[PDB]
């Protein structure tokens, strides 16, 4: 075969930016085996990347990322893979590509989780190419007709816009909404992020063709938004739909606390028989009476 | 305070009933009778109205104890 | 019917072997279902015995009766014979049988099928049988005498098995790739790989034996004789006792050479051993010649047994030998003297002049093979004033190494202590 | 499917960690009972 | 156990010093006394 | 499915490590 | 050093006993 | 396309041969490198050129190496030798035997001796065929030189200057002379307490005695030429902190619950 890359690595040392790029191309072709030799010479590729380059700035990044990946330093491999730019070619069944994708996803999730809690303006910038790689993975997962678990990646990365987009522009919107609500209530811990996700969920619910008022009221109970639930009830009673409101008020009494119930009742106070018996439901007279009778 | 801590542990873990018996199996086998009682009561609070099986398995030997 | 009776007894043994295979498969299923991502090592410990006891009729009946789950890959075995783990183990047995039959063509085809299947099925508890399959893939391509695509294939497999934090597969792949490099004498490549790779600190003792042997060989050819000697002594200590005769013979041969290079004299028990006398006899002659210090006998031994030296591979080492033969002379002189003069050293070593003896001894000091001083005002080599080595930190350092080792063993044992429910 | 591979890799890593962790916890509880 | 098949394969505790070739000690001592 | 399983395993790991910490401390007190 | 060596040997004996006990228990359960 | 480029490369190669068989070499070699890069240096397992023009590429690389050594340009020699080793050792079956090969292999071995890279020297020897090391002179001479050097016959290795199989093995002998003097200086370092000027001059071969201060002006083991030079005499406390570190480590390992 070749049995030695020493000649190819030596081609790099020359001062000709036409020989250098062929050396880089052969070196990438053979990095599948000769990372051991190329590792000691990586520094030359490092400096070659750190210049104008003339296609060296392009290909040397990928070569150095590949050799560092083979070596074991993923932290340094990521920087050069990002610097590669368009030469990464996310769409290919390569183990190096898969591993760098995983490392980049983990790095992005860590960075987002870390910087989310910090102030609104005091945020350490993300790398735009790293964001682009993450979004390319998002879009590939969407294109694979794999709508689910893109929500999971979005949840981990703490970015909502993708979460909203993937959970809307997908089949089985009810099923995806149920999965998202299960995740939001069960697994995730951060209360602020949970409230943000639930706000997105209720927005999606309401903008649905047939709003799921019961799940909307559940999410609103979680958010502690008596004004919003009161407005929902007001709209639901202005429009001719009474059984919806009946069950909504029953569930509101069964779940929400006394303070929330009092606040929503006050908001409603601010035919009238419907409103009066809604107030009675929320106060719980009939709930307790029915339980005692049972 | 030890017993109150164990009871609080049960109060924290009531949402995942299968999870608590893992915590309280070791506490139930404690030489401190107050910690043992706290373990029992924590299992009770956690698996209240659940009828779990490992919780009952842990409670029965404790039901047969020499301490009051 | 003597033939019929022999066949009947053979088929009884065959039924016993099928029962053993059934037990191994049950062990594999217990491994996969229950915790302890292990017990495949138990299933595989008897692998050499199963391979030895395998038979054509046995495997034919086994392929006919088994693989009932799904898939028609039985047509990749039946013409050659006339679940997550069970297919892998049974197929490993089948490829081993084709090896034993020497039908390397179908052996390699089916082995490539194994590699495609393992790549498709990314499982961890399976990775041990995967490592054994990789070992046998290297063996089949060795018998085919290509060992060319082997490099790249095992190397990518090593990348996979190190990206997944495995130990057994890591060790097996590293050893196989080192052997691939040595087969073509790519010693620089092997040295770079060893320098840039970390051998798993918890791998099978046999993988330690092989890795230590290969690293010692690299060091010996790289002119790190003390490192090679200690590494191969560790390899010999790690190697099995009542088996692996060929591995032991190779290690003994090259370690004898490396010690002669260091300037020492190998133990005679080696050559006296029943299993090694015939193989090591050329090296026994070599050691006799060097100890006698006679270039004529050394040269005649070399000329007589060059063939075995091609077969093993030591010539560079066997001339570095001559070098360390004069070195052996000077080391013995410094071992049995304290203030000998340069003229006396020259006379005893049969050197040409005290000037030449002075050069030789000074360089020996440099290399630290005699570890003395020298003084050419009066033309005599002084030795270091031996100090009472117990009122110093060397006993503390030795006992510290041994104490840390014992503490580590206790910690490992108390960790490995398991309670199965 | 690439994200599926990512998820399986993470799942296997955490599963192995949890397996050895439960092994160790069982042993520690046995010693504590002693 | 495992076999490394991949690698092809005086009752006495004799000593190296026994193989040396030199005159009989009687002859050596005789010559020594003769010349001294 | 996979994300839920991953979160389950993460939580199990955290729970098991805190349990081990507790067992270590309890063992120390038992020795005393 | 002597103390630590003795302690390590004792720990190895304990683990040998544990391995034998686990073997016995799993064999009995299987049968 | 391909054939026309091959013919042009052959023509410029023969032009270079006619030219020398200095600068003109330099730029001609640069142009040849660019042309062969438009072509391919190494078929690299999948192009399978099997080119008489690939043999020609090896040849032009050889002439580049000779020009480099004539110019006394070690980095260029290293580059050309790496690529020549690739060509020699990789495609042995397809390519035919290069009669003009062992000279350069021995030249590289001698260069390794001169640079004092003994490990690489011996790896190269191991790569080489076993028979050649004895049958041939071009390889055997560097082998013999290293054998003398590692045996310690510095007088013999000096005397072995004359037997140069070819003129190419020049100025590498001089770098080897420098390395030999450095090794002798290292022997004087690690041994030879209290050495004198005249014996040092006789042993460590200096230049003219008026330049005898050489290696004392550069290596300068704070010699202190006290007439005799004294060798500058170049060559009891409890490490309690380290020992306490070790003992605390023992206590930690004993007291940890695990």
UniProtKB/Swiss-Prot annotation, chain A:
<comment type="similarity">
    <text>Belongs to the proteasome subunit S1 family.</text>
</comment>
<comment type="subunit">
    <text>Component of the 19S proteasome regulatory particle complex. The 26S proteasome consists of a 20S core particle (CP) and two 19S regulatory subunits (RP). The regulatory particle is made of a lid composed of 9 subunits, a base containing 6 ATPases and few additional components including PSMD1. Interacts with ADRM1. Interacts with ZFAND1.</text>
</comment>
<protein>
    <recommendedName>
        <fullName>26S proteasome non-ATPase regulatory subunit 1</fullName>
    </recommendedName>
</protein>
<comment type="function">
    <text>Component of the 26S proteasome, a multiprotein complex involved in the ATP-dependent degradation of ubiquitinated proteins. This complex plays a key role in the maintenance of protein homeostasis by removing misfolded or damaged proteins, which could impair cellular functions, and by removing proteins whose functions are no longer required. Therefore, the proteasome participates in numerous cellular processes, including cell cycle progression, apoptosis, or DNA damage repair.</text>
</comment>
<feature type="modified residue" description="N-acetylmethionine">
    <location>
        <position position="1"/>
    </location>
</feature>
UniProtKB/Swiss-Prot annotation, chain C:
<protein>
    <recommendedName>
        <fullName>26S proteasome non-ATPase regulatory subunit 3</fullName>
    </recommendedName>
</protein>
<dbReference type="GO" id="GO:0005634">
    <property type="term" value="C:nucleus"/>
</dbReference>
<keyword id="KW-0597">Phosphoprotein</keyword>
<dbReference type="GO" id="GO:0005829">
    <property type="term" value="C:cytosol"/>
</dbReference>
<comment type="subunit">
    <text>Component of the 19S proteasome regulatory particle complex. The 26S proteasome consists of a 20S core particle (CP) and two 19S regulatory subunits (RP). The regulatory particle is made of a lid composed of 9 subunits including PSMD3, a base containing 6 ATPases and few additional components. Interacts with UBQLN1 (via ubiquitin-like domain). Interacts with ERCC6.</text>
</comment>
<dbReference type="GO" id="GO:0005654">
    <property type="term" value="C:nucleoplasm"/>
</dbReference>
<dbReference type="GO" id="GO:0042176">
    <property type="term" value="P:regulation of protein catabolic process"/>
</dbReference>
<dbReference type="GO" id="GO:1904813">
    <property type="term" value="C:ficolin-1-rich granule lumen"/>
</dbReference>
<dbReference type="GO" id="GO:0006511">
    <property type="term" value="P:ubiquitin-dependent protein catabolic process"/>
</dbReference>
<dbReference type="GO" id="GO:0000502">
    <property type="term" value="C:proteasome complex"/>
</dbReference>
<dbReference type="GO" id="GO:0016020">
    <property type="term" value="C:membrane"/>
</dbReference>
<dbReference type="GO" id="GO:0008541">
    <property type="term" value="C:proteasome regulatory particle, lid subcomplex"/>
</dbReference>
Swiss-Prot record, chain D:
<comment type="subunit">
    <text>Component of the 19S proteasome regulatory particle complex. The 26S proteasome consists of a 20S core particle (CP) and two 19S regulatory subunits (RP). The regulatory particle is made of a lid composed of 9 subunits, a base containing 6 ATPases including PSMC5 and few additional components. Component of a complex with USP49 and RUVBL1. Interacts with PRPF19. Interacts with TRIM5. Interacts with NDC80. Interacts with PAAF1. Interacts, in vitro, with the thyroid hormone receptor (in a thyroid hormone T3-dependent manner) and with retinoid X receptor (RXR). Interacts with ERCC6.</text>
</comment>
<comment type="similarity">
    <text>Belongs to the AAA ATPase family.</text>
</comment>
<protein>
    <recommendedName>
        <fullName>26S proteasome regulatory subunit 8</fullName>
    </recommendedName>
</protein>
<comment type="function">
    <text>Component of the 26S proteasome, a multiprotein complex involved in the ATP-dependent degradation of ubiquitinated proteins. This complex plays a key role in the maintenance of protein homeostasis by removing misfolded or damaged proteins, which could impair cellular functions, and by removing proteins whose functions are no longer required. Therefore, the proteasome participates in numerous cellular processes, including cell cycle progression, apoptosis, or DNA damage repair.</text>
</comment>
Swiss-Prot record, chain H:
<keyword id="KW-1017">Isopeptide bond</keyword>
<dbReference type="GO" id="GO:0005829">
    <property type="term" value="C:cytosol"/>
</dbReference>
<feature type="domain" description="PCI">
    <location>
        <begin position="75"/>
        <end position="239"/>
    </location>
</feature>
<keyword id="KW-0597">Phosphoprotein</keyword>
<dbReference type="GO" id="GO:0022624">
    <property type="term" value="C:proteasome accessory complex"/>
</dbReference>
<keyword id="KW-0832">Ubl conjugation</keyword>
<dbReference type="GO" id="GO:0000502">
    <property type="term" value="C:proteasome complex"/>
</dbReference>
<dbReference type="GO" id="GO:0005634">
    <property type="term" value="C:nucleus"/>
</dbReference>
<dbReference type="GO" id="GO:0005654">
    <property type="term" value="C:nucleoplasm"/>
</dbReference>
<dbReference type="GO" id="GO:0043161">
    <property type="term" value="P:proteasome-mediated ubiquitin-dependent protein catabolic process"/>
</dbReference>
<dbReference type="GO" id="GO:0005838">
    <property type="term" value="C:proteasome regulatory particle"/>
</dbReference>
<comment type="subunit">
    <text>Component of the 19S proteasome regulatory particle complex. The 26S proteasome consists of a 20S core particle (CP) and two 19S regulatory subunits (RP). The regulatory particle is made of a lid composed of 9 subunits including PSMD8, a base containing 6 ATPases and few additional components. Interacts with DDI2. Interacts with TASOR.</text>
</comment>
């Amino acid at each position: 075969m070749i049995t030695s890359a020493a000649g190819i690595i030596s081609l790099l040392d020359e001062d000709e930016p036409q020989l250098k790029e062929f050396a880089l191309h052969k070196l990438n072709a053979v990095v599948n085996d000769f990372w051991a030799e190329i590792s000691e010479s990586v520094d030359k590729i490092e400096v070659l990347y750190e210049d104008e380059g003339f296609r060296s700035r392009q290909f040397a990044a990928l070569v150095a990322s590949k050799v560092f990946y083979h070596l074991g330093a993923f932290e340094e491999s990521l920087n050069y893979a990002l610097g590669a730019g368009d030469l990464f070619n996310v769409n290919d069944n390569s183990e190096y590509v898969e591993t760098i994708i995983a490392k980049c996803i983990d790095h992005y999730t860590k960075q987002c989780v870390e910087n989310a809690d910090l102030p609104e303006g005091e945020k350490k910038p993300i790398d735009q190419r790293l964001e682009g790689i993450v979004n390319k993975m998002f879009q590939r997962c969407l294109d694979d007709h794999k709508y689910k678990q893109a929500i999971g990646i979005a949840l981990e990365t703490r970015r909502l816009d993708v979460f909203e987009k993937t959970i809307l522009e997908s089949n089985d919107v009810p099923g995806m909404l149920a999965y998202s609500l299960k995740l939001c209530m069960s697994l995730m811990q951060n209360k602020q992020f949970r409230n943000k996700v639930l706000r997105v969920l209720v927005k999606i619910y309401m903008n649905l063709e047939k709003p799921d008022f019961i799940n909307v009221c559940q999410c609103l109970i979680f958010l502690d938004d008596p004004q919003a639930v009161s407005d929902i009830l007001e709209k639901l009673v202005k429009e001719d739909n009474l059984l919806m409101a009946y069950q909504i008020c029953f569930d509101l009494y069964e779940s929400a606390s006394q303070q929330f119930l009092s606040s929503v009742i006050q908001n409603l106070r601010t035919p009238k028989d419907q409103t009066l018996k809604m107030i009675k439901i929320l106060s719980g007279e009939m709930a307790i009476e029915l339980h005692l009778q049972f | 305070v030890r017993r109150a801590a164990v009871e609080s542990l049960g109060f924290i873990l009531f949402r995942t009933p299968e999870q608590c018996p893992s915590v309280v199996s070791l506490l139930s086998e404690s030489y401190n009778p107050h910690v043992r009682y706290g373990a029992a009561m924590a299992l009770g609070i956690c698996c209240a109205g659940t009828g779990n099986k490992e919780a009952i398995n842990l409670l029965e030997p404790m039901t047969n104890d020499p301490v009051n | 019917t003597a033939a019929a009776a022999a066949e009947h007894s053979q088929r009884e043994l065959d039924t016993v072997t099928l029962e053993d295979i059934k037990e191994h498969v049950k062990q594999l299923e217990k491994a996969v279902s229950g915790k302890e991502p292990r017990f495949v090592l138990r299933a595989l410990r008897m692998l050499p015995s199963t391979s030895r006891r395998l038979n054509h009729y046995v495997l034919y009946k086994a392929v006919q009766g088994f693989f009932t789950s799904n898939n028609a890959t039985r047509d990749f075995l039946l013409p050659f014979l006339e679940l997550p783990e069970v297919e892998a183990y049974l197929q490993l047995l089948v490829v081993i049988f084709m090896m034993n039959s020497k039908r390397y063509k179908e052996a390699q085809k089916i082995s490539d099928d194994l590699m495609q299947k393992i790549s498709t099925q990314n499982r961890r508890a399976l990775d041990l049988v995967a490592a054994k399959c990789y070992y046998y893939h290297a063996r089949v391509y060795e018998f085919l005498d290509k060992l060319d695509v082997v490099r790249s294939f095992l190397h990518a497999r090593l990348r996979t098995a190190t990206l997944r934090h495995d130990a057994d597969g890591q060790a097996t792949l590293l050893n196989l790739l080192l052997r691939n490099y040595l087969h073509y004498s790519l010693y620089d490549q092997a040295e770079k790989l060893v320098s840039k790779s970390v051998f798993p600190e918890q791998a099978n003792n046999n993988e330690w034996a092989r890795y230590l042997y290969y690293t010692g060989r690299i060091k010996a050819i790289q002119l790190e004789y003390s490192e090679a000697r200690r590494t191969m002594t560790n390899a010999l200590r790690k190697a099995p006792q009542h088996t692996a005769v060929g591995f032991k013979q190779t290690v003994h041969k090259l370690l004898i050479v490396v010690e002669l290079l260091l300037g020492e004299i190998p133990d005679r028990l080696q050559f006296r051993q029943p299993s090694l006398k015939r193989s090591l006899m050329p090296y026994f002659l070599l050691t006799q010649a060097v100890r006698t210090g006679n270039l004529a006998k050394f040269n005649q031994v070399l000329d007589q047994f060059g063939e075995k030296f091609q077969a093993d591979g030591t010539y560079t080492l066997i001339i570095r030998l001559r070098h360390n033969v004069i070195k052996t002379g000077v080391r013995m002189i410094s071992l049995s003297y304290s203030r000998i003069s340069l003229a006396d050293i020259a006379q005893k070593l049969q050197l040409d002049s005290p000037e030449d003896a002075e050069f030789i001894v000074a360089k020996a000091i440099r290399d630290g093979v005699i570890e003395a001083s020298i003084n050419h005002e009066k033309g005599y080599v002084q030795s270091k004033e031996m100090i009472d080595i117990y009122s110093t930190r060397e006993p503390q350092l030795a006992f510290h190494q041994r104490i840390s080792f014992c503490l580590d063993i206790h910690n490992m044992s108390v960790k490995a202590m398991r309670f199965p429910p | 499917s690439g994200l599926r591979q990512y998820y399986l890799s993470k799942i296997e890593e955490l599963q192995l960690i949890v397996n050895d962790k439960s092994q160790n916890l069982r042993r520690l509880q046995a010693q504590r009972n002693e | 156990d495992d076999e490394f098949e991949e690698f092809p394969a005086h009752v006495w505790e004799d000593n190296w010093d026994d193989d040396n070739v030199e005159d009989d000690f009687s002859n050596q001592l005789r010559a020594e006394l003769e010349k001294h | 499915d996979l994300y839920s399983r991953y979160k389950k395993l993460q939580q199990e790991l955290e729970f098991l490590e805190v349990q081990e910490e507790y067992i270590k401390d309890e063992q120390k007190n038992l020795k005393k | 050093y002597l103390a630590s060596l003795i302690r390590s040997v004792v720990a190895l004996h304990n683990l040998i006993n544990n391995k034998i006990a686990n073997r016995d228990a799993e064999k009995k359960e299987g049968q | 396309t391909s054939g026309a480029v091959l013919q042009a490369a052959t023509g410029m190669y023969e032009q270079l041969k006619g030219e020398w068989n200095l600068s003109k070499c330099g730029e001609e070699l640069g142009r040849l490198k660019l042309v062969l890069l438009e072509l391919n240096f190494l078929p690299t397992t999948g192009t399978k050129l099997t080119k008489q023009q690939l043999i020609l590429a090896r040849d032009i690389l050889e002439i580049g190496a000779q020009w480099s050594i004539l110019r006394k340009d070690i980095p260029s020699f290293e580059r050309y030798m790496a690529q020549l080793k690739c060509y020699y050792f990789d495609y042995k079956e397809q390519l035919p035997e290069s009669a003009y090969m062992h000279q350069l292999l021995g030249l590289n071995l001698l260069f390794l001796l001169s640079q004092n890279r003994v490990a690489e020297f011996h790896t190269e020897l191991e790569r080489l065929p076993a028979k050649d090391i004895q049958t041939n002179v071009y390889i055997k001479h560097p082998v013999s030189l290293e054998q003398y050097l590692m045996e310690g016959s510095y007088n013999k290795v000096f005397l072995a200057k004359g037997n140069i199989p070819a003129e190419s093995y020049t100025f590498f002998i001089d770098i080897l002379l420098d390395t030999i003097r450095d090794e002798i200086a290292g022997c004087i370092e690690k041994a030879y307490e209290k050495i004198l000027f005249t014996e040092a001059t006789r042993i460590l071969f200096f230049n003219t005695p008026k330049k005898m201060t050489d290696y004392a002006k550069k290596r300068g083991w704070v010699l202190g030429p006290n007439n005799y030079y004294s060798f500058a005499s170049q060559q009891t406390t409890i490490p309690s902190t380290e020992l306490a570190k070790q003992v605390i480590e023992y206590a930690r390992q004993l007291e940890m619950i695990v």
